[PDB]
Design a protein around this ligand. Sequence first.
Ligand SMILES: *[C@@H]1O[C@H](CO[C@@H]2O[C@@H](C)[C@@H](O)[C@@H](O)[C@@H]2O)[C@@H](O[C@@H]2O[C@H](CO)[C@@H](O[C@@H]3O[C@H](CO[C@H]4O[C@H](CO)[C@@H](O)[C@H](O)[C@@H]4O[C@@H]4O[C@H](CO)[C@@H](O[C@@H]5O[C@H](CO)[C@H](O)[C@H](O)[C@H]5O)[C@H](O)[C@H]4NC(C)=O)[C@@H](O)[C@H](O[C@H]4O[C@H](CO)[C@@H](O)[C@H](O)[C@@H]4O)[C@@H]3O)[C@H](O)[C@H]2NC(C)=O)[C@H](O)[C@H]1NC(C)=O
Ligand SMILES: *[C@@H]1O[C@H](CO[C@@H]2O[C@@H](C)[C@@H](O)[C@@H](O)[C@@H]2O)[C@@H](O[C@@H]2O[C@H](CO)[C@@H](O[C@@H]3O[C@H](CO[C@H]4O[C@H](CO)[C@@H](O)[C@H](O)[C@@H]4O[C@@H]4O[C@H](CO)[C@@H](O[C@@H]5O[C@H](CO)[C@H](O)[C@H](O)[C@H]5O)[C@H](O)[C@H]4NC(C)=O)[C@@H](O)[C@H](O[C@H]4O[C@H](CO)[C@@H](O)[C@H](O)[C@@H]4O)[C@@H]3O)[C@H](O)[C@H]2NC(C)=O)[C@H](O)[C@H]1NC(C)=O
Lengths: 13, 208, 207
Amino acid sequence: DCAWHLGELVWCT
Amino acid sequence: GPSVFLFPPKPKDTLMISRTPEVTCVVVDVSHEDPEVKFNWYVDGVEVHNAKTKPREEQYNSTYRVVSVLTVLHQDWLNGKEYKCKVSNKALPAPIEKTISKAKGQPREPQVYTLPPSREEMTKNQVSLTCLVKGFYPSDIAVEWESNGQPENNYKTTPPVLDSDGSFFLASKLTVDKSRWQQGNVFSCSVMHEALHNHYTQKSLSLS
Amino acid sequence: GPSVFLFPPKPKDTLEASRTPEVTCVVVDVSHEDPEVKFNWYVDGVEVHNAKTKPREEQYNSTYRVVSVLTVLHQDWLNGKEYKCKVSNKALPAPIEKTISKAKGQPREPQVYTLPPSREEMTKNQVSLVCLVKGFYPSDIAVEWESNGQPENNYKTTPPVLDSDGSFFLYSVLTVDKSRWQQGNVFSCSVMHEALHNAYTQKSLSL
Ligand SMILES: *[C@@H]1O[C@H](CO[C@@H]2O[C@@H](C)[C@@H](O)[C@@H](O)[C@@H]2O)[C@@H](O[C@@H]2O[C@H](CO)[C@@H](O[C@@H]3O[C@H](CO[C@H]4O[C@H](CO)[C@@H](O)[C@H](O)[C@@H]4O[C@@H]4O[C@H](CO)[C@@H](O[C@@H]5O[C@H](CO)[C@H](O)[C@H](O)[C@H]5O)[C@H](O)[C@H]4NC(C)=O)[C@@H](O)[C@H](O[C@H]4O[C@H](CO)[C@@H](O)[C@H](O)[C@@H]4O)[C@@H]3O)[C@H](O)[C@H]2NC(C)=O)[C@H](O)[C@H]1NC(C)=O
Ligand SMILES: *[C@@H]1O[C@H](CO[C@@H]2O[C@@H](C)[C@@H](O)[C@@H](O)[C@@H]2O)[C@@H](O[C@@H]2O[C@H](CO)[C@@H](O[C@@H]3O[C@H](CO[C@H]4O[C@H](CO)[C@@H](O)[C@H](O)[C@@H]4O[C@@H]4O[C@H](CO)[C@@H](O[C@@H]5O[C@H](CO)[C@H](O)[C@H](O)[C@H]5O)[C@H](O)[C@H]4NC(C)=O)[C@@H](O)[C@H](O[C@H]4O[C@H](CO)[C@@H](O)[C@H](O)[C@@H]4O)[C@@H]3O)[C@H](O)[C@H]2NC(C)=O)[C@H](O)[C@H]1NC(C)=O
């Protein structure tokens, strides 16, 4: 799973 | 003589895989007579070679400012590696060394809690939405607000405060027109921190 | 040469009739060969003679620390009077002057709002009770907590933050055992500020 912030990629585990 | 200042990456840059974190060795008071500066870089004692020098900048006070930038990996920084910049210049009896790194200590996950306005604020033209972020270590963090995918920019955030259990807390206050709060609009607190799942959590808040 | 620092009185001291507010003039790096420091105080350019010198104090880094303390009146400080400390010493080419006073600009009354713990916090051992203090100027303030006449000490308060309307705000957070909150106890947030009625207000919070 992945986190996004205002469209931009944050991090994925 | 010349003096050195060494700065960490921006929290956001170390936390967002799509951004590029860098450490910055800034050398001020560089003389016109001897402007040549040599930089050595070390990551945990081991020398690296991928540093790049930014263009020289002449200052209003007759000195040069020379700046060397070292790109770093996210996880090296987050794993707490130490970055040393060594500066040599003719007008300097001996080279100057400076070391920086993440704050030492086990990282703790921030607890993120959104809080509606007081019933007492409801008289006023504008209302306060509060994001309480407590129990995080180290103090490196980013807090932003949004609504319907769009950044809400009318907020302010306290600097991190050291708590009695050794972690940090802060609060972020977003001020909206009361009418927008009444209109059922959902607001979101975005928190970025190393010890969160995927470096990111979001907490929402709307008229109850 | 010596260096000088001039400190304002404590917010609480200026705001409580019973306490005694003072301006403090500190001289550091006073030499062993010339320890004598002359102080001259002025209040709005008018020299006053009621300052009292503190005991001279050895710093053990080759220098003395010499302090002069001038008591001030509540209203004088609040009405924005300016305080000047002039320091003279043999190791100064020229006397050093410092001036301090209240921050300038129309005082604004703080809005005090108390915020209950989040439903999500209610699973933890302890909960956070929040006191949002906004809309105030100047930033000179004090915040305290209590319950049933007794002081609750387990809190932290952020420093004042400048807001987009030129006023200041802060948050104070009291952490209590969940049980104490659950069982219906009243907790109170006490705020002192020159622009409050009677320089004081209190807001309360309970389940
Ligand atoms: C001749 O003039 C020069 C330059 O002066 C400038 O212009 C003149 C006309 C005046 O207006 C000056 O006021 C101007 O600054 C003088 O150079 C100055 O010397 C000072 C000391 O000698 C030095 O003070 C130290 O500042 C530290 C903080 O510096 C910050 O913030 C200031 C302003 O707050 C800013 O101007 C600085 O450039 C610096 O900014 C940071 O830079 C870094 C690196 O670029 C940024 O980090 C990077 O950011 C990028 C993105 O851009 C990316 O994200 C990277 O990942 C990241 O690495 C960072 O974001 C910037 N931050 C900000 C807020 O802007 C203090 O911390 C430090 O204090 C420490 O040490 C002290 C002892 O000296 C202690 O007291 C203290 O406790 C601390 O430990 C210093 O005070 C000035 O910064 C410096 N100015 C510049 C521009 O270099 C020079 O002195 C003078 N010479 C003579 C002979 O008169
Ligand atoms: C020899 O040593 C001395 C003493 O140092 C101590 O001992 C040595 C051996 C070491 O162990 C040190 O670590 C010890 O501190 C050295 O003296 C120091 O010199 C510094 C600069 O030369 C000077 O820096 C300036 O500090 C200002 C803030 O000082 C505050 O806070 C510090 C701690 O943060 C504290 O130590 C100071 O005493 C002072 O504390 C305040 O005292 C006032 C007055 O008493 C209090 O106000 C009163 O409170 C009472 C209640 O008790 C009452 O209510 C009154 O009404 C009220 O007025 C106040 O509450 C105290 N505050 C706090 C937080 O505790 C800075 O503001 C200043 O910065 C400004 O200027 C800079 C440029 O110079 C700017 O960069 C900056 O941005 C600012 O504009 C300076 O940083 C140290 O204070 C000073 N320390 C002491 C104890 O005097 C000496 O240098 C050394 N000599 C040599 C040759 O090495």
